[PDB]
Symmetry: C8
Subunit: 30 residues, 8 copies
């Protein structure tokens, strides 16, 4: 359904934020 | 539907936050 | 509809957060 | 409606977070 | 209604986050 | 209702994030 | 109900974020 | 149901953000 799919698009975007935060950890450590 | 589309607009905005955090990571690496 | 519009208002606010985070990247880089 | 209005209250609060992040950006620039 | 009130409780919590972020700006500036 | 109560649980968790950010502010001030 | 339980899973995840932010306060203070 | 499952996908993504923040904490401690 379109609303479940839209909700899933939110979850994928949140995963992008987690990845970006991971990059900041790499930046600090380096 | 309008609700599903508005939920997608939230997902797009959340992606924009991910891109901005990536910019912070790169600014730290530099 | 009023609920779709309210949801869209959330997406616009999230976009404001992304912009502010972009500013922090500029601040760090400078 | 009360639900749409409560959702708008969330959007206003999310804007307040954007303003606060802008203050961090300016504090770094200073 | 109970669901609108619960949603409003979310908005108030988000406002608490904005205030805390404001404190971080004060901390940095000081 | 169970849905309203679960939404309140999210609001309580969001408050916990505010408290944690306040701890960062105080750690910076110190 | 499954939707209330899913919402509760969101609240527990948000609590994990609060805990992680608490760790950052400890890291800064130390 | 598909909606409950999509909401769970959001919770999993939010956990991923917690793990990433923990990495920042450890990078600071190091």
């Amino acid at each position: 359904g379109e609303i479940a799919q839209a909700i899933k698009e939110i979850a994928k975007a949140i995963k992008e934020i987690a990845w970006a935060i991971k990059e900041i950890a790499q930046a600090i450590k380096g």
